[PDB]
Amino acid sequence: KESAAAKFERQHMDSGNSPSSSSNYCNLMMCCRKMTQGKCKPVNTFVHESLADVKAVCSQKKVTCKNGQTNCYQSKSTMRITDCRETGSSKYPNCAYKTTQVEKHIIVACGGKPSVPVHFDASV
Amino acid sequence: KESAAAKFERQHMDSGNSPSSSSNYCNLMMCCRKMTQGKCKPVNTFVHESLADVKAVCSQKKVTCKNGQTNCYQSKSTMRITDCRETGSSKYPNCAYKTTQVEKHIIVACGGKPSVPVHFDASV
């Protein structure tokens, strides 16, 4: 079972000076979104645009994915994204990320019917 | 199973939330700490002091828990904590919370051998 002491630690402890800092965004989001279980996903992009705008990318510029697959598309316009990358100090299960906010074109793989994004390939 | 489409949203979508927002702490933390599974925990407090400083509360002022038990202790100094409370708009699985930074004495319940904090009782 989860011991009572360990439960208390999970439910109530967050030791630090600036826990509510924006630079903590990735740590909490990478955790909330389940990408730190078993291992630390090294890199991940969050997109801050409407889902209608991201879904629209599936009918814009065609391009080859990084893995050779041919179902990739590049957004016509730049989008507000947050880039999360493990720090040189991150070691599972103590995953740590640096948060970076930039505006870049996103490249995603679309699949399914209707055709929707099913993989974030890269940003340019 | 989880659809590839849903997976994309969970992993790369964050509309309606800005990284540079201090007000978002609770929503991200309540989710990261797994207290939004099954139902939204109505209230939860996070402590920002050291684990050592919090464990030391078990040797401070003895008081009665809100539920009548007698293993509760109150900190001598005020501590830096974050108050998380479900908004009136909150609706599982879309749990919403208000983040309120405060500085009050905390009352925790102690148990085990050695006696460490095992339940957050209240702040005062």
From Swiss-Prot, chains A, B:
Part of the intact protein present: 27 to 150 of 150
Disulphides: C26-C84, C40-C95, C58-C110, C65-C72
Highest taxon above the source species: Eukaryota
Subunit (UniProt): Homodimer; disulfide-linked.
Organism of origin: Bos taurus
Catalytic activity: an [RNA] containing cytidine + H2O = an [RNA]-3'-cytidine-3'-phosphate + a 5'-hydroxy-ribonucleotide-3'-[RNA]; an [RNA] containing uridine + H2O = an [RNA]-3'-uridine-3'-phosphate + a 5'-hydroxy-ribonucleotide-3'-[RNA]
Record-annotated active site: H12, H119
List of residues that carry Deamidated asparagine: N67
Regulation: Allosteric regulation by both substrate and reaction products.
Residues that coordinate or bind substrate: K7, R10, K41, P42, V43, N44, T45, K66, R85
EC number: 4.6.1.18
Protein function: This enzyme hydrolyzes both single- and double-stranded RNA.
GO molecular function: identical protein binding; lyase activity; nucleic acid binding; ribonuclease A activity; RNA nuclease activity
Chief location: secreted
Gene, per the UniProt record: SRN
GO biological process: defense response to Gram-positive bacterium
Name of the featured protein: Seminal ribonuclease
Family: Belongs to the pancreatic ribonuclease family.
GO cellular component: extracellular region
